[PDB]
Amino acid sequence: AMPVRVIVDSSACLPTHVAEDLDITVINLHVMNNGEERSTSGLSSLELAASYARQLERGGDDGVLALHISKELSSTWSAAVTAAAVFDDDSVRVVDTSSLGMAVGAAAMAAARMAKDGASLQECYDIAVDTLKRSETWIYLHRIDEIWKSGRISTATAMVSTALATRPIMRFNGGRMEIAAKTRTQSKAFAKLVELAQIRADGEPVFIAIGQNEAREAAKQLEELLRNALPEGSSFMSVDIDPTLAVHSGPGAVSVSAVFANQA
Numbered sequence: 211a212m213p214v215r216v217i218v219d220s221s222a223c224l225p226t227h228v229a230e231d232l233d234i235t236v237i238n239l240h241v242m243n244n245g246e247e248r249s250t251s252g253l254s255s256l257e258l259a260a261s262y263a264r265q266l267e268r269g270g271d272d273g274v275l276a277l278h279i280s281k282e283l284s285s286t287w288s289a290a291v292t293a294a295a296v297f298d299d300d301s302v303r304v305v306d307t308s309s310l311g312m313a314v315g316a317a318a319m320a321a322a323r324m325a326k327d328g329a330s331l332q333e334c335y336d337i338a339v340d341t342l343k344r345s346e347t348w349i350y351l352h353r354i355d356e357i358w359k360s361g362r363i364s365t366a367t368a369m370v371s372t373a374l375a376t377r378p379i380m381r382f383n384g385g386r387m388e389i390a391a392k393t394r395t396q397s398k399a400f401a402k403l404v405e406l407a408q409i410r411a412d413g414e415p416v417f418i419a420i421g422q423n424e425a426r427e428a429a430k431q432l433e434e435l436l437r438n439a440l441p442e443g444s445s446f447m448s449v450d451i452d453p454t455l456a457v458h459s460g461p462g463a464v465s466v467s468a469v470f471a472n473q474a
């Protein structure tokens with residue numbers, strides 16, 4: 211048997227050389243630059259059928275695990291489930307992530323490593339699900355213009371962009387996007403983020419991926435802050451926020467994807 215093959219989309223934010231080293235297939239989400247405005251698009255079921263069949267062929271049909279952006283942020287999952295039903299029962303297993311970014315990238319790396327040791331599809335599936343259940347995703351927005359126009363803030367969350375404050379920490383819970391702090395300076399926002407991750411760590415080492423979009427310096431300052439505050443033996447990785455997501459986060463955005471010892 212050939213190892214199970216792992217596929218994510220670009221929203222997972224895996225660095226290119228990591229995806230390459232671990233043989234994780236990356237499919238890019240769409241950015242349309244037409245006229246002045248940028249917009250984005252999920253993956254169609256047709257592109258996923260092609261992408262999955264190609265990984266099945268390559269892995270001698272011993273299984274594909276697919277990990278895509280949350281079904282509440284994108285039509286991708288819905289396309290993935292349609293493409294997966296085109297193959298024999300359980301050739302393609304679609305993880306229902308309720309997440310995006312390196313919480314998903316992390317689940318994919320754990321699944322790829324297990325696949326490498328000959329783990330079955332079900333077993334790679336379980337590792338991926340367990341990594342996600344123990345993750346959190348926070349985002350610092352340096353401005354709220356692009357998040358507001360994205361359609362991913364429910365009106366229950368904020369009826370008017372004013373309700374977001376000016377530099378909030380956002381968090382994903384149950385797939386959906388929430389305000390974790392109505393902060394107004396980067397300093398206060400970072401301090402609060404560090405606070406939340408620290409509580410959530412609960413004295414145990416954490417794995418952390420810090421994402422940035424045009425915020426290289428800021429992401430460095432935040433990492434430094436998190437190093438001092440998080441339990442000893444925590445590890446830190448840097449990633450670039452997928453340009454598809456950067457369309458909706460705006461410039462200056464910094465994300466923290468964390469995997470913890472325990473459940474929430």
Ligand SMILES: CCCCCCCCCCCCCCCC(=O)O
Nearest residue numbers: 250251252284285311455458459465
């Ligand atoms: C931890 C990752 C960084 C956070 C990125 C900012 C918030 C992104 C909001 C969702 C946009 C999803 C666009 C996906 C493509 C699409 O379906 O059109």
